[model samples]
Target chain A: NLPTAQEVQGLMARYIELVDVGDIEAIVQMFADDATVEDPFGQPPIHGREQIAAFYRQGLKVRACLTGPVRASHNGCGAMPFRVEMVWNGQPCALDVIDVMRFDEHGRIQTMQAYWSEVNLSV
Target chain B: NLPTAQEVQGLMARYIELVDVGDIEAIVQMFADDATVEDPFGQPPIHGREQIAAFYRQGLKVRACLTGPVRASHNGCGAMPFRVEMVWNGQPCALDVIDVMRFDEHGRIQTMQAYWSEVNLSV
Candidate 1:
């Protein structure tokens, strides 16, 4: 069965919290074994549990917080807007991003896609 | 050529403004002749410009503003979080939504998917 909207939002919030915690373990456990992560959406996706761990360690290096409430769809998918404070080109900036997560019947994330580009950076 | 991050973000902002204006003409022009719209995401997509117009006029019957900045991807697509203060099931409620828009080569919307479920409704 598809996850309810409240469940999806809770997952999204937990994701943000786990990432900010920088421990990586709790966050990686949110994904299924066969899950794929396509950051920036159209880019190549990361696969496998090992690959997923490394990716999150580096990708989620900074603290992030939701800019708005999570949005859930009729399907078992949800989206949330957040900001990553980072240094780019040696300049401090905030990267605004939106992430979409689709879940399996077990409520594990089946796929994750991040939406953001350099244009979303604000110094 | 693919749209730049700034361009995609502009399209998103304009779209929200047009919808809030309650004049669907300008917003409908944002789509290509053969664009598709999938609201609530899992539902069947509405096709063609005429059908798209009717869909927006009915679906976007309320004011919606960005809850956060628009997110642009490396490709010509963007996502934004917004809330629509609407009446649902004869009850006054607010519906939170996130919309992802993919643009065609000419900068017209190729596809638009709105992510939201009844669970997102707040009294």
Candidate 2:
């Protein structure tokens, strides 16, 4: 059976919290073993738990804040918009991003895609 | 000021209704003149209203169903998961897609990015 909307929303809520705290280990555990992530629409995907973990380890250095509540589909998909503040190459920058995640039957994220552009970044 | 979540959700509701009815013209009108659409990650975007209209004109030949309600961010962004059934090269096919849209200050869609894969497409 598919996960309920509340279940997905809860997962995403924890996700945002973890991201905000820069909890790389816990955040990596949110994905399925074979999950894939694409941070930008046109970029290559990072596949599998190992790679996904490594990717997040690098990204978790940034401070993230959810700009809104999590929205979930009945069939185990959730999306949220967020802002990230970080020093990119010694320059303080902020980025606005939207992420859509599809979950497996077990509530682990199977795919996560982020939508953003250079235009959405302010340095 | 950014649009309220309700306003973004309403815009997406109308967007889904128009897409369900195959109203390509109305769908085109929902976007800003300089909006961009990237239907699926890792592909070049369709820029400008005219090109966006032509792209949807071709896409509207399909039958679409919203699998879930629209989810919106407080900052004028929304996401929805949907299914599309259509005939391609005389063969029946179906696809599962998640679309994330960002709205401009005037409430017109400024950017739309779809997340899907060939694996999500069944022939």
Q: What is the DockQ of each candidate?
A: 0.78, 0.05
Give the CAPRI rating of model 2. incorrect
| lDDT of candidate 1 over B10-122, digit per residue (tens) | 98899889888877888889899999999988889999999999987777637788888888876899999998887766877888889999998888999999998877778
What's model 1's lDDT at B117? 85
List RMSD in Å for every model shown: 2.1, 11.7
Which digits, one per residue and each the tens of the lDDT, describe model 2 over residues A1-123?
A: 356767776788788889989888899998999999987754788999999888887766578877755656656776666788999899999877778888888889999977665545789
Q: State the TM-score for model 1.
A: 0.91
Runs off by more than 4 Å, candidate 1:
A87-92, B87-92
Q: Write the per-residue lDDT of candidate 1 for residues A30-78, one digit (tens) a residue.
A: 8999899999788999997789999987766378899888888757899
Clashing pairs in 1: none
Write model 2 residue lDDT over B1-123, tens digit each, in one string.
355667776787788789889988889998999999987644689999999989987777577876655655555776666778889999999877767888999889999977565545779
Per-structure clash totals for the candidates:
0, 0
Give the clash count for model 1. 0
Chain B TM-score for candidate 2: 0.92
Which has the greatest DockQ? 1
TM-score of 2: 0.55
